């Protein structure tokens, strides 16, 4: 998460 569900 943090950047469009970009992993974490």
- Ordered DSSP codes for 1-8: --SSS---
The contacts of residue 3 (CB under 8 Å, 6+ apart) are none
Q: How was this structure determined?
A: NMR
How many Å separate Cα 2 from the centre of its chain? 4
2 SS3 class: coil
């Amino acid at each position: 998460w943090x950047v469009x569900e970009a992993x974490d």
